[PDB]
Symmetry: D2
Subunit: 253 residues, 4 copies
């Protein structure tokens, strides 16, 4: 009885996996039988619950605090991961922040807060992933359906921050080929997390939420484990021949 | 189990050979009962069926030429008759064409579009009609839609598919059926081989395998695409785990 | 002179009424001689021809069903016969179709594709064969090919997605006579077709709600699509080649 | 008829000292616009462009500003309105090219590219919106490699994909002033930047003359020729005209039909 997309005796790291989409990727890869490094930066207990979750279903994990806005903290994060589990097969760039505002009101402090994590951060996560990763490995980065599909106004700073991700992946896949490493991006849609709720107020968390379901031909919201399942396939052996691509997981939204 | 289709029934057009075949075998290995459609290759159709039984699923092989819209309806009513239900339809059948616009006859257009564009349209259609709720539709395109020369006619036949799927996914939502396309690129079959001989300044001079190996250099993974490479993306897409991929075109080429 | 077409001859399919009449009047305005192609509406076409005569450019009406290839061949033979040259060729003629995928018929698909897709391909081919060196080919798509996905618009959208793939490759084939190929992909240009899809109240009221879609707060008119077409097929538009230009004003 | 002329309009182009920007700025002048020739390090060529524009019956002025420093950007737009009294058109053109494998790419090298190409352009568009007449025009410059694959080109190509995403949303925001925002995505326009990129992506570039590698890239165009600054400037011309209005929020690629 053939079991697909498994990751047994493979190590995976997932920036900002304490809560939200990243935490499901952390678990899924754990379920499909990867050992998992669960990076957080502000949510220490949240991360220890994800380490706990992955252990209960028969694989190992350690949480590692790191601000991935800080390239040396990223060097240490990858340096520490390989120190612990011995190697690293999978690196998922998940960590991100949202911003809202009309072009006229967007400040220098605000451009940077956003770009420092979502774009520079993810790029430098990807850098140390290539240096630290084994041959046949997997980088995965997170964009947004807004990058180019969705056209939310007063969403320019955020969308641009992920538009750069869209352009990194097709080229990274050329560069990363000489360690036989595939690079792909996932562009989630409206995944239900603390972030989705902060961007719906633009009332109740769930009342707002109940509108977005009436917009997917599948009449439900996207949830973190809907994106996780697409990253699990992509970091599997099976899905090696998807390379340099931005997958969009929105449900037809 | 994740990625498995235990209890599910599928149908794959042009699954006697090439990507078609590898799709059918993969769906089987995942737990699906596979309908295997051919139009000219019953021997390989019957081999595909037999390989699907051996690994311990079930299959039949119903002859049907998907240019003929009544042969498509029959293909599907017979699909539902033999296994009882249909969950999954994979529109895969296709022909390549080559030529400069200046030398493209009517006959050559009608040949290419009747199967690649129109045929696939009325597979998607008779899929929606015949499918259980929560089911799955896949159509096959090419990475060359959105630029090798003398490749207009075929290229545009698949650009139409890239357009259809986004809308279909709107239409098809009311039975919660997801519709996506795969845009394969450089996959080792008689179609890839008959192509490599045209878009390589030597072509007939070199050997299919010598050409095949030239193209291996193109991928940053430094290898060739094989039907099992594509089969696996479809399988995920038609798993319940692939649900939240909907209305999209996945190019599977290896960075090419 | 800026993007003027003084000394050129153009041909526009379905230029009797619609964006085409406007592309025809526009290429006229910029000093081109214009073949005006109709199939069903000679009285409209005659209005266009006069309006191009009336701002001091020559023009003719030629009946041709761009679904019948033989008639495409005659139209291009006769156009070169009259003006002795053809520099620009605009594939405009198209039809609209609504329906859930479950309802679409072989007949409906073939009514659409015959003209929207297959017709445009063969206008394009015949353009290549008759066109002077350094000439121009425009094909007509929709912002729905890809950009937007409306329910029950699958057939039409497909018809124009085919076009998007054609122009990229066409631009390479046609470059062996230094001819550039592009599509403009309109997006709600007020016309007789808009009023159909608009319907799916009065026309003018179904437009006032349409206005709110553009961040420029206004709908689209043939001139909006025509100015772009005039640029692409000018000398100065040469370096735009093998492209789709979605003219929607935001939408 | 005299079509897309910009008579009585005022325009600003960043880095209109050399390359594309200059041809952009000479084009707007030729089309009747009064032009503000921004530059950071090339004051003489900037001045030659102002004189070349004054020569064809319009007016121009060179302002110095480094569009890496956001306060120099505000100073640039404040000064430009001060001199000519208004501004209709804003062309974010300034940019740099970088080559390197992800691994070799550094913090310093990364900030160097993003601070001008991405951050710079964003804030040129912020201040343009704040200074521009209603009915005006924002253009940003992108690249045909942002999404249209070239090795050791991630950092450059990245910097520009951010622009593509920016112009689609800028179109909406800028709509409350009936302002069209659009990007041009140039290909390999012959410039000192093209020659620096023809040196790296050619079998043995330094063993070749810039013209040699040029002729080589020409054989790759369906138009058997190299694109030139005037080829992009002609397209910018259309976009910023009354007539180009219904192209809003899109990214146009001017490449001659290939790389
Ligand atoms: N609807 C959506 O959610 C949606 C849609 C499109 C794209 N995305 C993208 O999906 C990704 C994740 O979204 P989400 O919904 O999961 O977000 P979220 O719930 O707000 O969670 C944020 C995650 O980011 C981590 N993080 C933030 N700043 C960090 C830093 N400097 N260093 C390390 N980690 C940091 C957080 O960990 P700590 O709490 O430990 O800081 C947390 O795990 C983001 O890139 C987002 O843009 C999401
Ligand atoms: N290989 C590639 O590189 C590549 C790249 C892009 C896209 N594709 C697409 O992938 C699909 C598979 O092609 P392939 O590579 O597998 O090539 P292939 O080996 O040529 O396969 C052709 C398949 O098409 C079926 N077919 C042909 N005419 C048919 C008809 N009237 N009715 C039903 N089925 C018919 C054939 O069945 P019989 O011959 O048995 O009748 C055969 O199984 C096609 O959609 C193709 O356009 C392939
Ligand atoms: N209008 C829009 O909002 C919109 C949006 C996206 C795309 N488009 C595209 O824009 C183009 C023009 O559409 P429109 O809005 O101007 O449409 P329209 O008002 O319906 O005009 C149709 C034009 O097509 C011609 N035509 C139809 N069938 C023909 C045939 N067999 N042979 C020759 N000519 C034929 C008509 O001429 P006869 O009357 O002589 O038959 C008429 O000139 C079309 O290709 C359409 O698909 C339009
Ligand atoms: N040429 C191509 O092949 C090509 C292809 C695709 C895209 N592009 C893009 O098109 C644009 C034009 O490139 P190009 O070929 O014209 O390049 P170029 O010859 O290098 O010209 C560079 C321009 O950038 C300006 N610049 C540099 N740093 C600046 C700063 N801090 N502030 C203001 N201006 C600054 C320069 O002015 P100073 O003299 O003052 O530095 C000069 O005007 C760039 O955005 C480029 O990325 C070019
Ligand atoms: O991207 C996000 C959250 Br960061 C998003 C939110 C709401 C909707 Br409706 C669509 C979206 O793409
Ligand atoms: O279409 C085919 C073979 Br039918 C194809 C082959 C190789 C590449 Br790279 C792209 C393609 O689209
Ligand atoms: O398709 C049509 C008319 Br055929 C259309 C109408 C309105 C808008 Br907004 C976009 C469109 O594409
Ligand atoms: O942008 C650059 C380097 Br500035 C470029 C050069 C040549 C070609 Br072909 C495409 C490009 O995008």
């Amino acid at each position: 009885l053939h079991i697909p997309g498994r990751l047994d005796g493979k190590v995976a790291l997932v920036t900002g996996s304490g809560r939200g989409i990243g935490a499901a990727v952390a678990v899924h890869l754990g379920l499909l039988g990867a050992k998992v490094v669960v990076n957080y930066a502000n949510s220490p207990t949240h991360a220890q619950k994800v380490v706990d979750e992955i252990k209960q279903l028969g694989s190992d994990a350690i949480a590692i605090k790191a601000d991935v806005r800080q390239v040396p903290e990223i060097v240490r994060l990858f340096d520490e991961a390989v120190a612990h589990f011995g190697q690293l097969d999978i690196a998922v760039s998940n960590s991100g922040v949202v911003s809202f505002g009309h072009l006229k009101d967007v400040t220098e402090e605000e451009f940077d807060r956003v770009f420092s994590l979502n774009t520079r951060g993810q790029f430098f996560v990807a850098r140390e992933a290539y240096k630290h990763l084994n041959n046949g490995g997997r980088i995965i980065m997170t964009s947004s359906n807004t990058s180019r599909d969705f056209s939310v106004p007063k969403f320019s700073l955020y969308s641009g921050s992920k538009g750069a991700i869209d352009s990194f992946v097709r080229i990274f896949s050329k560069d990363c080929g000489d360690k036989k490493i595939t690079v792909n991006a996932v562009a989630p849609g409206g995944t239900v997390t603390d972030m989705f709720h902060d961007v719906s107020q633009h009332y109740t968390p769930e009342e707002r939420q109940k509108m977005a379901a009436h917009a997917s031909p599948l009449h439900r919201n996207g949830f973190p484990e809907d994106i996780a399942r697409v990253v699990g396939f992509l970091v599997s052996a099976e899905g090696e021949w998807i390379n340099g691509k931005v997958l969009t997981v929105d449900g037809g939204a």
